[PDB]
Amino acid sequence: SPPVLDLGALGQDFAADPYPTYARLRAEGPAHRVRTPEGDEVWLVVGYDRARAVLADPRFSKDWRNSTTPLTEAEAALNHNMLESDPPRHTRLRKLVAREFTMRRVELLRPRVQEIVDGLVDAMLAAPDGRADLMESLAWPLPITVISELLGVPEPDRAAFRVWTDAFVFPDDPAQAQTAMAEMSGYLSRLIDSKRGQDGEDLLSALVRTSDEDGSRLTSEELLGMAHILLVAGHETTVNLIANGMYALLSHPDQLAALRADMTLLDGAVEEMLRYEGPVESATYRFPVEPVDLDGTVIPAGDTVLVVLADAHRTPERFPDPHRFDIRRDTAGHLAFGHGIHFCIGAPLARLEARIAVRALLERCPDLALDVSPGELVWYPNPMIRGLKALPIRWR
Ligand code: HEM
Ligand SMILES: CC[C@H]1OC(=O)[C@H](C)C(=O)[C@@H](C)[C@@H](O[C@H]2O[C@@H](C)C[C@@H](N(C)C)[C@H]2O)[C@@H](C)C[C@@H](C)C(=O)/C=C/[C@H]1C
């Protein structure tokens, strides 16, 4: 089916503000064939109700064996993860790490996350001119530092994830993203082998042991896929929640003032950051196992479907006055972390990081503000991730 719109042709204007386009589409129907800025042809599902339903609908699979579109060699190497599986494989894989990310288990990481944030912020505050780029100084370093310590990724090996992730989000090429994947995949395999038999206590070491104890519970391919998903799934997302959220807060002085006046509104503010400018613009690939009809529009089986969480969050019927960033707004039911069996397992960790980061910036940066007109900001064209290239800020 030919695309009705080529998102790439819309340019940076769409990347910066995609909402009007999604809403115009929603006004004419729930499903639309489009071409992403990358060149991929997929279906977009818009509207909160339809989005929510599709996310949990078992008729839409995440197993590539149900996609008419073949996986590339590199992707086929990291495909065996819970997010790209259906029950029972998904059920088995998720159980292996579910207990690791509960709210109570994550709470024990507060002291260390707080140290990391205080460290990064104080380093940022060393700027002789009271200016810095929040992405480079805090948004990017925080999540990678936290997850690497949890998984056991050596400090020296983290710089490479900077370049690799930039390739995944913001290429320069189709090809390039694949190259980055092959590189990272190769690295993960070597990191896993370096753990085997070393008696480490980090999560990756424990997973390696789990795989060695029972290859049926976690195969070599699934072990590699687990390392991949735990590193990727929470990196780019958390990074952009922090940057996007602060951008939202700093571009709405009234909300900043409100949070300043009552820090107990912090948790609600982070939830509205997810609703208003969540990092996941469109969910990961879903494939109908059978032809599915959405309000008259039939999506053929095997086709690629992207649920546009960004649009669901701007649906008036569900979030009144959607264009307004209101930190005290009712956010119950948002889909920023997904919905259904694939609901984010790292949500408590992401919230811990964001809440601690947001508070530190507000309590230690006197007169914190954006140091650039918003029209000068550059947003990623990637269909799944909503994010900035940089976020220049200033303080007294
Ligand atoms: C602000 C940060 C985060 C956001 C907005 C986010 C969002 C999401 C979303 C939308 C999904 C579902 C995607 C879909 O259904 O297509 C998901 C799945 C997942 N996320 Fe997160 N995530 C974040 C942080 C994390 C962190 C910190 C971890 C690390 C533990 C993580 C690990 C995962 C995993 C493993 C899954 C797969 C769940 C499954 O398939 O059962 N996420 N996340
Ligand atoms: C928590 C949701 C994150 O998504 C994922 O973890 C999934 C499993 C993932 O890693 C893929 C969606 C990647 O997206 C793309 O990767 C390219 C190299 C190939 C491309 N292909 C389908 C055309 C597509 O799979 C992931 C590396 C994407 C980047 C931008 C990312 O970090 C997003 C993460 C969340 C959406």
SS (H, E, C) the chain: CCCCEECCCCCHHHHHCCHHHHHHHHHHCCEEEEECCCCCEEEEECCHHHHHHHHHCCCEECCHHHCCCCCCHHHHHHCCCHHHCCCCHHHHHHHCCHHHHCHHHHHCCHHHHHHHHHHHHHHHCCCCCCEEEHHHHHHCHHHHHHHHHHHCCCHHHHHHHHHHHHHHHCCCCHHHHHHHHHHHHHHHHHHHHHHCCCCCCCHHHHHHHHHHHCCCCCCHHHHHHHHHHHHHHHHHHHHHHHHHHHHHHHCCHHHHHHHHHCHHHHHHHHHHHHHHHCCECCCCCEEECCCEEECCEEECCCCCEEECHHHHCCCCCCCCCCCCCCCCCCCCCCCCCCCCCCCCCCHHHHHHHHHHHHHHHHHHCCCCEECCCHHHCCECCCCCECCECCCEEECC
Q: What is the position in ligand 2's atom list of the atom closest to the CA of 380?
A: 30
Sign of CA dihedral 234, 237, 243, 247: negative
CB 117 near ligand 2, within 6 Å? no
**386 alpha carbon to ligand 1 midpoint, in Å?**
15
User: Exposed, middle or buried by CB within 10 Å (0-12, 13-18, 19+), for 383?
Assistant: buried
> How were these coordinates obtained?
X-ray
For helices 253-261 and 220-250, angle between their N-to-C axes, nearest 10 degrees: 100
Helix pair angle (220-250, 266-277), 10° resolution: 100
Rounded to whole angstroms, how far apart are CA atoms 280 and 239?
11
For the chain, after which residues does the C atom lie more than 2.5 Å from the next written residue's N, i.e. where is it broken? none
**Interatomic CA distance for residues 300 and 31, integer angstroms:** 12
Q: Which ligand is nearest to the CA of 345?
A: 1
254 burial type by CB count under 10 A (0-12 exposed, 13-18 middle, 19+ buried):
exposed
Contact assessment for residue 23 and residue 2, using Cβ atoms and an 8 Å cutoff: no
- What is the C-alpha end-to-end distance of the chain, expressed in Å? 55
Domains observed in the chain:
1-396 (1.10.630.10)
For residue 238, the CA-to-ligand 1 centroid distance in Å is: 9
Tokens of 154: 């050596």
Q: CA 61 to CA 291: how far, in whole Å?
A: 12
Annotated binding site: 84, 177-181, 228-236, 344
Structure tokens at 158: 């983290």
Partnered with residue 35 across adjacent β-strands are: 6, 41
Measure Cα distances from 366 to 30, 127, 152, 260 in Å: 45, 14, 36, 11
Nearest CA, atom 24, ligand 1: 234
51 close to 312: Cβ distance less than 8 angstroms: yes
Report the atom number in ligand 1 closest to the C-alpha of 341: 41
- 141: CA distance to ligand 2 center in Å? 20
Annotated binding site for substrate, which residues? 84, 177-181, 228-236
CA angle, 75 as apex, 71 and 76 as ends, to 5°? 65
CA–CA distance, 243 with 257 (Å, rounded to integer): 18
Closest CA to ligand 2's atom 11 = 284
Tokens 């990064």 sit at which residue?
Answer: 120
**Interval between CA 309 and ligand 2 midpoint (Å):** 15
Rounded CA-CA distance 394/365 in Å is: 8
Q: Apex CA 139: angle with CA 138 and CA 144, to 5°?
A: 95
Q: Which of 274, 306, 384, 386 to mutate to test the pocket of ligand 2 (most atoms within 8 A of CB)?
A: 384
